[PDB]
Amino acid sequence: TGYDLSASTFSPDGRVFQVEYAMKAVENSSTAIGIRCKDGVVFGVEKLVLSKLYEEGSNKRLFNVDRHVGMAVAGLLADARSLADIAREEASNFRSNFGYNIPLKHLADRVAMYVHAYTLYSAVRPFGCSFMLGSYSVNDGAQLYMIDPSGVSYGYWGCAIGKARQAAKTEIEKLQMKEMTCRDIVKEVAKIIYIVHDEVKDKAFELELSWVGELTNGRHEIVPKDIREEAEKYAKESLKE
Amino acid sequence: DLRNVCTEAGMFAIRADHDFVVQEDFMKAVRKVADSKKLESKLDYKPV
Amino acid sequence: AERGYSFSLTTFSPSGKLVQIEYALAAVAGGAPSVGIKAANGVVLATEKKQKSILYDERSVHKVEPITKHIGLVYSGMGPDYRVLVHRARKLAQQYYLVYQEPIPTAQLVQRVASVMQEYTQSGGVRPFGVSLLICGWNEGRPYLFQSDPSGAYFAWKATAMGKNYVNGKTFLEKRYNEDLELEDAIHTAILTLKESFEGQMTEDNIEVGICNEAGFRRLTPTEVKDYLAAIA
Amino acid sequence: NQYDNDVTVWSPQGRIHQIEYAMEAVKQGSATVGLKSKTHAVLVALKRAQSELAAHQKKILHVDNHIGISIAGLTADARLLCNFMRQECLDSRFVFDRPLPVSRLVSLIGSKTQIPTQRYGRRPYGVGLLIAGYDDMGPHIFQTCPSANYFDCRAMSIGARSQSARTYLERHMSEFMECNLNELVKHGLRALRETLPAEQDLTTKNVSIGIVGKDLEFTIYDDDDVSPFLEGLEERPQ
Amino acid sequence: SRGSSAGFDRHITIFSPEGRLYQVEYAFKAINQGGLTSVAVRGKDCAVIVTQKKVPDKLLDSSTVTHLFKITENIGCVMTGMTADSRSQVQRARYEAANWKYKYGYEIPVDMLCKRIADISQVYTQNAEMRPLGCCMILIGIDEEQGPQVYKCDPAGYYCGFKATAAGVKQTESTSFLEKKVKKKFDWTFEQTVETAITCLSTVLSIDFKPSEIEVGVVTVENPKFRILTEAEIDAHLVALAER
Amino acid sequence: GDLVGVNKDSYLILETLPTEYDSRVKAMEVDERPTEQYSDIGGLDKQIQELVEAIVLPMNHKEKFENLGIQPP
């Protein structure tokens, strides 16, 4: 009728339709899972290879938003790289004025509040992009937040985003995780990915993984090559069996 | 829709070829039914 | 973020009407009844207070505001739009008082408050205000009663009504208003002409009255109104 | 049909039409290939003429002394995004006294073409780029879209009837890493020769080659600098 | 009349031929979209907020789902509605509160900090450029000369002072339960109030809570800091209401 | 309710008839449409399973719904 042409228009129902649609553009992307343990956070992206022509392990969906804050995205990728720069810019103005790495509880509320300002006006279009911020500190432990197009942030112990959002949240509910060292989680993540992926709907995939926890001393990296292989071998074995 | 859930849990069993259901069968069925129930059109309260 | 729209939403129709102001006058006529009665030494502004449970605290808001030591308002229509105009008036009064060191005359204040409401029928991306202000004041020896409309016009009255059933109340007042009243009826006769449009029982916390004599405008304490409600005072 | 008049509206399906369309502006453009080795990156572009008395529009635009691009789409937009890159690489010489490394250049194009796909009544840039550069990580190719995504490729093609090239390039992607310089350009031409009609062939008046290497600042070849590469070229039989 | 369309009038915020703003009568329907309910009850020494807390999964952390926000140290408030808009308006409250203290030097009354949340909302009504926020703030806090107080401000602006309110899905049903316990009248001690709030929410939803299904915000005159009661303290009142 | 023939003058019941459906419902014939084979529906392999298990399976193996204790969808 005319309740979808604007973010500035409630519908008679009671809900802004332009934000609804944005969230459905996320649901049509590949899957990313986060899972927080007791001494770190591990990230997992199910990056599809759509040709053999794209270079391997390149054009990632795992940003560094700060020197101790991962960001794993799903959804329309262009708008993702845009947020990853607004966040870097915030987590720099925070170290400038307050002089210490920004606390992830706050970096989240500030990046959600920036997404929210884009669902109010008609002059802009709400972001098509849900994403998780992980972080580790020794004064706060691991924290894992997840933002979405609405502009909502919520603490999580695990979560997933994308086209297999449902199947993956099961695998993490059937997993103890307030007791496992970082090292043991990475094996679980790989195994969960392999399960939730369909090779009858997609071709193949590359498995992307990220520490951030006690192992690395509060930095955020990508898992080293050797440990990534071990997690792929232990994941083919749980699909055999 | 709870009558559906109990059936769906049955169907996974017939698919796997068991003579019995389990605690996952009812866990999956609630996720499935719950997706289509939300998808399939919004229900409004009609007061008298 | 945004820039803002630039194009007026109040537009002429083939009739020669500004449809938006015509409608905003119908919002005015949904609002709570309000009467105004210039006396011969004071002005009375009485109004039907809004409530719809016993949970509301009938002393946390006021439909009768003071704008200056010598000015008052009541309104009829949308309650949010009233707190905006009460607040642009109180500032107008303070710029006037800051340049002439003299309380702003009541003819002046209505003529400026009106030009703010006129600005919202010819500005970009806004709707007109949804209220009619009834402005009393007592300067230079006289009392004054004005009324500005969401249009922007304003008319001096000797007594009037606005809001719901303001055609029954302007008739009722037309007869009962014989000049040279004392200040104390305008209250009495005012309260009566609220009753010609009010269903229920009036109490000290259910209507709000404000007077405005040489001593300056003042809202009437709940006790004070309970006495005029002897329906004999 | 109402979700096509702005970048600002989403579609019930969860896309944006104005961004989809823009990318049809790219498939109207003239075929162009890009592949790499481990020492050279090459841009081979099939120019085009709109008459018999007329020259051919330049597909390869020189950016800096280690970055080329090959446009495909509105040319007025291609020189609006080329001036911004020329300006980004003169900002780096002037502040850091180094060449701007390509990965961090494609990330600025990414930040500047993202913007107008989210503001009212502005459009996406109707041009796709292939960015052949060589810095301290060997050779790169980068495909840019009007959507504002981008990709690190090992050998990409855009434009019209580009799909025919993409398959040729996907069967030979193994051989590319071991080529000398002249052997690589042969591949690029043989891939670009699969995008034509079957009736005509690559001449010297509608091919443009761009080579950047470890010791070779980005050059461009036209007319009779292209002849040392068409001569020696295999015959393509039907 | 009778609901007609002026063409544009359900897509921006301009008057209908009737004399209403369809765009604001819709933004109220967002508050009930949330699916939560919050009651607030005033005593004679303290004001209480009690909120239903709904953790849908076992994954969500339970300590970062809250609806109770600290605006000052002497002003709490509960947010019902679209969670995005909510947090956006709480952020804005905190700003005003601390801007007030900075300009006048005596921390802000609960009266005025609503009047300003109300007036920011009102602008979103009057312009066409944006929608109004789809949420509804209820502030509580002890005033230095009027006892405790409760205020609720709506998406349109209109804000008022209360003795007991609710907001959200069962906003009609609650205020019928409450007004009965207000015309009777009690002492309204600290234990009286918390009692009336939980029993109102518990009967209108039919839950009969676990300490982990409500969060209870409270502010007493003896100690004017805004506390959020832990699960240990909440349970003392639930098993005391199971006895009585 | 029953339909019955009747002698068109002396109103005698002559026989009982088979119930009758509107000719537009008999026109909605159970046709005989040419085989097409589930192998000749491209993609959509999952979909075929989801339908067959709900419609086709209860036509022969209702035994497997009775042993589990459920009713087909």
PDB file of C-alpha atoms in Angstrom, chain C residues 2-5 9 20 23-24 26-28 50-61 65 75 78-81 83-84 87 90 120 124-131, chain E residues 6 8 12-21 42 111 115 118-119 122 125-130 149 151-152 156-165 175 178-179 182-183:
ATOM      1  CA  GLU C   2      18.525  13.840   8.011  1.00  0.00           C
ATOM      2  CA  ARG C   3      18.120  17.326   6.538  1.00  0.00           C
ATOM      3  CA  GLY C   4      14.389  18.020   7.004  1.00  0.00           C
ATOM      4  CA  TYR C   5      11.603  18.624   4.506  1.00  0.00           C
ATOM      5  CA  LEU C   9       2.127  20.743   4.032  1.00  0.00           C
ATOM      6  CA  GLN C  20      -4.860  21.770   7.357  1.00  0.00           C
ATOM      7  CA  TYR C  23      -8.816  20.226  10.432  1.00  0.00           C
ATOM      8  CA  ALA C  24      -6.645  21.522  13.272  1.00  0.00           C
ATOM      9  CA  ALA C  26     -11.670  20.290  14.535  1.00  0.00           C
ATOM     10  CA  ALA C  27      -9.044  18.941  16.940  1.00  0.00           C
ATOM     11  CA  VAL C  28      -9.620  22.099  18.982  1.00  0.00           C
ATOM     12  CA  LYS C  50      -8.703  15.787  32.331  1.00  0.00           C
ATOM     13  CA  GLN C  51      -8.537  12.459  34.171  1.00  0.00           C
ATOM     14  CA  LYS C  52     -10.012   9.024  33.625  1.00  0.00           C
ATOM     15  CA  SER C  53      -9.179   6.956  36.721  1.00  0.00           C
ATOM     16  CA  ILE C  54      -8.435   7.615  40.361  1.00  0.00           C
ATOM     17  CA  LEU C  55      -4.775   6.764  39.743  1.00  0.00           C
ATOM     18  CA  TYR C  56      -3.875  10.097  38.150  1.00  0.00           C
ATOM     19  CA  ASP C  57      -2.447  12.674  40.542  1.00  0.00           C
ATOM     20  CA  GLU C  58      -4.567  15.775  39.919  1.00  0.00           C
ATOM     21  CA  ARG C  59      -1.874  18.189  41.051  1.00  0.00           C
ATOM     22  CA  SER C  60       1.088  17.069  38.896  1.00  0.00           C
ATOM     23  CA  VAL C  61      -0.078  18.912  35.759  1.00  0.00           C
ATOM     24  CA  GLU C  65      -0.461  28.156  33.372  1.00  0.00           C
ATOM     25  CA  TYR C  75      -6.089  25.657  26.169  1.00  0.00           C
ATOM     26  CA  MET C  78      -3.733  18.511  22.165  1.00  0.00           C
ATOM     27  CA  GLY C  79      -1.801  18.575  25.441  1.00  0.00           C
ATOM     28  CA  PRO C  80       1.703  18.188  24.003  1.00  0.00           C
ATOM     29  CA  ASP C  81       1.273  21.151  21.663  1.00  0.00           C
ATOM     30  CA  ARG C  83       3.549  22.740  26.549  1.00  0.00           C
ATOM     31  CA  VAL C  84       5.380  23.966  23.439  1.00  0.00           C
ATOM     32  CA  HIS C  87       7.279  27.617  26.637  1.00  0.00           C
ATOM     33  CA  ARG C  90       7.459  32.469  28.513  1.00  0.00           C
ATOM     34  CA  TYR C 120       3.782  26.614  11.366  1.00  0.00           C
ATOM     35  CA  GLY C 124       8.684  23.294   5.859  1.00  0.00           C
ATOM     36  CA  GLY C 125       7.594  19.881   7.014  1.00  0.00           C
ATOM     37  CA  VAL C 126       5.347  20.735   9.954  1.00  0.00           C
ATOM     38  CA  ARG C 127       1.681  20.588  10.847  1.00  0.00           C
ATOM     39  CA  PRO C 128      -0.112  23.493  12.540  1.00  0.00           C
ATOM     40  CA  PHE C 129      -0.482  23.532  16.299  1.00  0.00           C
ATOM     41  CA  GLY C 130      -3.525  21.745  17.651  1.00  0.00           C
ATOM     42  CA  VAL C 131      -4.693  24.214  20.294  1.00  0.00           C
TER      43      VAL C 131
ATOM     44  CA  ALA E   6      -6.741  13.263   3.461  1.00  0.00           C
ATOM     45  CA  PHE E   8      -1.330  11.665   3.138  1.00  0.00           C
ATOM     46  CA  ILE E  12       3.173  11.422   7.916  1.00  0.00           C
ATOM     47  CA  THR E  13       2.033  13.246  11.014  1.00  0.00           C
ATOM     48  CA  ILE E  14      -0.573  15.707   9.811  1.00  0.00           C
ATOM     49  CA  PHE E  15      -4.171  16.066  10.909  1.00  0.00           C
ATOM     50  CA  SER E  16      -6.918  13.864   9.489  1.00  0.00           C
ATOM     51  CA  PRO E  17     -10.294  15.295   8.488  1.00  0.00           C
ATOM     52  CA  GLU E  18     -11.564  13.958  11.822  1.00  0.00           C
ATOM     53  CA  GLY E  19      -9.141  15.818  14.070  1.00  0.00           C
ATOM     54  CA  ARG E  20      -6.606  13.151  15.033  1.00  0.00           C
ATOM     55  CA  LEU E  21      -3.054  12.009  14.219  1.00  0.00           C
ATOM     56  CA  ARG E  42       3.641   4.518  44.923  1.00  0.00           C
ATOM     57  CA  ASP E 111       9.217  16.085  37.645  1.00  0.00           C
ATOM     58  CA  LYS E 115       8.865  17.037  31.065  1.00  0.00           C
ATOM     59  CA  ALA E 118       8.101  14.451  26.918  1.00  0.00           C
ATOM     60  CA  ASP E 119       9.083  17.493  24.900  1.00  0.00           C
ATOM     61  CA  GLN E 122       6.594  16.023  20.982  1.00  0.00           C
ATOM     62  CA  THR E 125       5.016  14.346  16.482  1.00  0.00           C
ATOM     63  CA  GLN E 126       4.990  17.798  14.912  1.00  0.00           C
ATOM     64  CA  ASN E 127       7.419  17.216  12.030  1.00  0.00           C
ATOM     65  CA  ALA E 128       6.885  14.911   9.092  1.00  0.00           C
ATOM     66  CA  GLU E 129      10.578  14.051   8.798  1.00  0.00           C
ATOM     67  CA  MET E 130      10.589  11.145  11.267  1.00  0.00           C
ATOM     68  CA  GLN E 149       6.799  10.081  42.845  1.00  0.00           C
ATOM     69  CA  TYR E 151       5.661   9.672  36.168  1.00  0.00           C
ATOM     70  CA  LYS E 152       4.829   8.109  32.837  1.00  0.00           C
ATOM     71  CA  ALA E 156       3.010  11.701  21.884  1.00  0.00           C
ATOM     72  CA  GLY E 157       4.335  13.761  24.776  1.00  0.00           C
ATOM     73  CA  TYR E 158       1.487  13.687  27.271  1.00  0.00           C
ATOM     74  CA  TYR E 159       3.022  12.817  30.638  1.00  0.00           C
ATOM     75  CA  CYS E 160       1.418  12.678  34.052  1.00  0.00           C
ATOM     76  CA  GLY E 161       1.964  11.928  37.722  1.00  0.00           C
ATOM     77  CA  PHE E 162       0.540   8.754  39.202  1.00  0.00           C
ATOM     78  CA  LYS E 163      -0.101   6.682  42.279  1.00  0.00           C
ATOM     79  CA  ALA E 164      -0.034   3.409  40.352  1.00  0.00           C
ATOM     80  CA  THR E 165       0.342   2.737  36.643  1.00  0.00           C
ATOM     81  CA  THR E 175      -5.274  -0.362  36.132  1.00  0.00           C
ATOM     82  CA  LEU E 178      -4.869  -1.320  40.988  1.00  0.00           C
ATOM     83  CA  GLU E 179      -7.578   1.294  41.414  1.00  0.00           C
ATOM     84  CA  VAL E 182      -6.122   2.576  45.959  1.00  0.00           C
ATOM     85  CA  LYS E 183      -9.655   3.618  46.974  1.00  0.00           C
TER      86      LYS E 183
END
